[PDB]
Paper text:
All prior observations combined led to the following three constructs: the basic double salt bridge reintroduction [name]–[name] as well as [name]–F88A and [name]–[name]–F88Y. Upon analysis by ITC, an increased SPD affinity was observed for each of the constructed variants. Binding modes of constructs containing [name] are again similar to the SPD binding of PotFs, revealing beneficial enthalpic and entropic shares. To our surprise, all solved structures adopt a [name]/D-like semiclosed conformation. Also, SPD adopts similar positions to the one in [name]/D in all structures. In [name]–[name], no specific differences to [name]/D are observable. In the [name]–[name] structure, R91 shows an additional alternate conformation that can interact with E69. The respective R254 can partially interact with D39 and N231. This time, R254 adopts an alternative conformation in [name]–[name] and [name]–F88L, favoring one of the possible interactions in each, respectively.
To gain insight into the evolution and designability of ligand binding and specificity, we analyzed the homologous PBPs, [name] and PotD, which are [name] putrescine (PUT)-binding protein and spermidine (SPD)-binding protein, respectively. They constitute the first elements of two separate multicomponent uptake systems (PotFGHI and PotABCD) to transport the cationic polyamines PUT and SPD across the cellular membrane. Still, the protein-binding modes differ: [name] shows affinity for PUT and SPD, whereas PotD exclusively binds SPD. Prior to this work, we grafted the seven differences in amino acids from PotD binding pocket onto [name]; this resulted in [name]_SPD, which will be referred to as [name]/D throughout this work to keep naming for mutants more concise.
Author numbering: 28 to 369
Write the structure that this text describes.
């Protein structure tokens, strides 16, 4: 009988031939579906009976569901290359998944500033503060960049944390007043200069020159940069992990508790743990993978990019998302609607 495997992953988060290569090597039929919204994935998981054997949630969402019985523990004896994973990244993911019981770290990155090098330098000068959140969180700078286009993510959790860190508050403040007060105060001063709040349109807009500065996910900004280079359109997109720090986050593979094809799922996970497999993915999607054995195999342009693989001094400035109580979640959501309506 045919062996089958159903995977649900983000768009633009695998190499073009990863699945084909796996099928050639193993004889397993893969059904590979994609989503571009975390809201979509989580709704399906909470409803249950998804039909997926492997899914790719955020590490933070995993914490919220470790008690909901959504996932089943990973049998590490079926993953002999588990030893290839970076122990430091396992520790960070274990903040949401104690003892790394349910999740295999896949890729990770930061939320920083993507920008058009030429347009930012034209408007703010040669010494534009591209190494600082000042570039996009000082109203005086956004007023000058307004005409060339400014985008923020449509993501209250990441944007509020970014603002709180910049203001010198706890990035993960549990104080409702921090969100409704100082954080909202700054966002309302910036708001008239922001063209839109959206978590994917900025990728193509950066690549085509339609916006000049964005809050964005590192690898997606690097994808925009590469798309502009492949189009030979002369647009120069870069990305900055600013000097004040930034949020780091981790996407993981996990196995729904009702998965029908568990043996095949473990074959695919151990396939991903082979160093060349995940290095090849990083080469194509411009995200750092969590496999320490894989790093030397990654192309120089990606591995040596400190906005993809940050060195120790930059990693020390990164913070991670803490899961908040529902009451803070709702304050955050309410305040974000007010910010956007401004
Ligand atoms: Cl995360």
């Amino acid at each position: 009988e045919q062996k089958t495997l159903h995977i649900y992953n983000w768009t633009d988060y695998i190499a073009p031939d990863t699945v084909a290569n796996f099928e050639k090597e193993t004889g397993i039929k893969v059904v590979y579906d994609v989503f571009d919204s975390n809201e979509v994935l989580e709704g399906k998981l909470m409803a249950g009976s998804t039909g997926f054997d492997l899914v790719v949630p955020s590490a933070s969402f995993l914490e919220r569901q470790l008690t909901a019985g959504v996932f089943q523990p990973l049998d590490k004896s079926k993953l002999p290359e588990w030893k290839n994973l970076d122990p430091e990244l396992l520790k960070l993911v274990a903040k949401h998944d104690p003892d790394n019981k349910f999740a295999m770290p896949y890729m990770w990155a930061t939320t920083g500033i993507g920008y058009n090098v030429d347009k930012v330098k034209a408007v703010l000068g040669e010494n534009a503060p591209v190494d600082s959140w000042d570039l996009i969180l000082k109203p005086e700078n956004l007023e000058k960049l307004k005409s060339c286009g400014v985008s923020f993510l449509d993501d209250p959790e990441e944007v509020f944390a970014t603002v709180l860190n910049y203001l010198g508050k706890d990035p993960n403040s549990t104080k409702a007043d921090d969100y409704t007060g100082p954080a909202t105060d700054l966002l309302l001063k910036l708001r008239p200069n922001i063209r839109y709040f959206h978590s994917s349109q900025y990728i193509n807009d950066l690549a085509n020159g339609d916006i000049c500065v964005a809050i964005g996910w590192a690898g997606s900004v690097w994808q925009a940069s590469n798309r502009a280079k492949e189009a030979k359109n002369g647009v120069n997109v870069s990305f900055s992990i600013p000097k004040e720090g930034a949020m780091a986050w981790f996407d993981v593979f996990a196995m729904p508790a009702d998965a029908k094809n568990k043996d095949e799922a473990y074959q695919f996970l151990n396939y991903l743990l082979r160093p060349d497999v995940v290095a090849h993915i990083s080469d194509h999607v411009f995200y750092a993978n969590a496999n320490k054995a894989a790093t030397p195999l990654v192309s120089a342009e990606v591995r040596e990019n400190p906005g993809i693989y940050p060195p120790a001094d930059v990693r020390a400035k990164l913070f991670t998302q803490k899961v908040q109580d529902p009451k803070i979640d709702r304050v955050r959501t309410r305040a974000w609607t007010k910010v956007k309506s401004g």
